[PDB]
Write a protein that binds this DNA or RNA. Structure first.
Lengths: 130, 130, 127, 125
DNA sequence: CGTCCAGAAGTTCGAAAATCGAACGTCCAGAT
DNA sequence: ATCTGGACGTTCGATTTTCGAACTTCTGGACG
């Protein structure tokens, strides 16, 4: 049948790494942060559009905390709790710059352990016989 | 340039439609509902390996609130709130299997509107000015 | 490890529906025809930007025989051979526009039968 | 608006990486090789199932020319040629039962530029 | 017209935790 | 090294809402 745009945007999502649900490492990470990490993972594209790619070829965020409270839509302490909880797992790294130069942010890929794969094995092969 | 199996399961996500954060008809959903929708909306594949398909070829769930209390990782009261929220916003519809049988559930696709394909687009094309 | 702009574009490909290799219908399709559909498909998310959206949601192309031979990287003799291949399977429809206006192109989603489904499900399991 | 099995199995495809059409390193590949590559890529999900995973985490292939011929749906000759074209472009290797390793494509600084300038390729009004 | 019963929904209240304001602590250049 | 600007973050209770456990209410439809 036809390719409808009405349906096109039904097929656009916010990726959330399954491993955020199997590794005790990412356990301590709440849902408000999980969603956040997804919205950032989405902006990953947008930044390439702004040519935010260092010499070694890495996609970063020159976003001011103001913008983030609009991207992730929340308050001051909220944003913080997220970045701290995130930064305490290897999901996000940041380096200050002082003055008026907005903070540099580097989102990262999570780590998969062989224990994780076994777990996600069930979250997909959990057929009938329990 | 190998295909690391670590990379593979690191590329597995719980897709959450972006129109969820745009349409006011979906603003109701909580960050624990949106994610719940995802987990189940991904379980559709399991539903097929089980033959949970009817005549019109529609794919449904036959999960007891017990299983649902695991898949979403919560308790009745929470699981209830989740279900009633999804259902209230016409995102999931169950058929009240009486007797002693569990509950048959029909997950849904979202309804993307005009101000949705617009609001979502404005972000994907947020190329900083040059 | 960071997100590398290299890996991102390394993971941008063209999609060819698995049904093309299972449905006895789509057995007439040539490899060039399959790939053709694959690329044209990707030009969809791009045809949204050109606002070539139908008032029903349908998405069409306004690509001249030149921009096509350009996209599909081929001659004018090979192009039509493809169009009339993806035409005889309902994968691609055509409607004119007159003299000098490049005819419209609506791309059709493939068709699947119960015989297709089984074939696919089998092809995703082995000993 | 339900979730139908038609739509579900209608949206499962093979993946042929764009860089194959842009980069010069890979320009030397007949379409019969591109698609063949795509199928092998889609074979990975099974490789894991077969437990064909290497200690370093790499996914390999333990197929015979006999079996491979069935997968790609090609003859003895077409195989060696498709397997030689993919091998010379660093997208496949072997350890001459017959063992094979699939490789990801190499992207160059201009590749990004070309791909980027093609998927963002719109036209002014 | 009831006799069945397990799984689903919907109550009551203490315990747990997210939200927020607003002041305090901190960091980073670069000019002193 | 030492001020210092503006932007990042932090510690802290009190107001507000969420969450949990065991109990209770309710929902089917063939069969006596």
């Amino acid at each position: 049948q036809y390719f409808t745009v009405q349906e096109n945007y039904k097929e656009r999502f916010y990726q959330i790494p399954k491993v955020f649900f199997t590794s005790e490492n990412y356990k301590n990470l709440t849902n408000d942060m999980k969603i956040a990490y997804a919205i950032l993972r989405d902006r990953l594209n947008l930044s390439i559009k702004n040519s935010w790619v260092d010499e070694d070829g890495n996609i970063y965020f020159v976003y001011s905390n103001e913008k983030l409270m609009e991207i992730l839509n929340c308050k001051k302490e909220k944003l913080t709790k997220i970045k701290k909880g995130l930064e305490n797992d290897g999901l996000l790294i940041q380096k200050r710059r002082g003055l008026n130069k907005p903070n540099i942010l580097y989102l990262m890929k999570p780590i998969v352990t062989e224990r994780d794969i076994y777990k996600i094995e069930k979250e997909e092969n959990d057929v009938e016989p329990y």
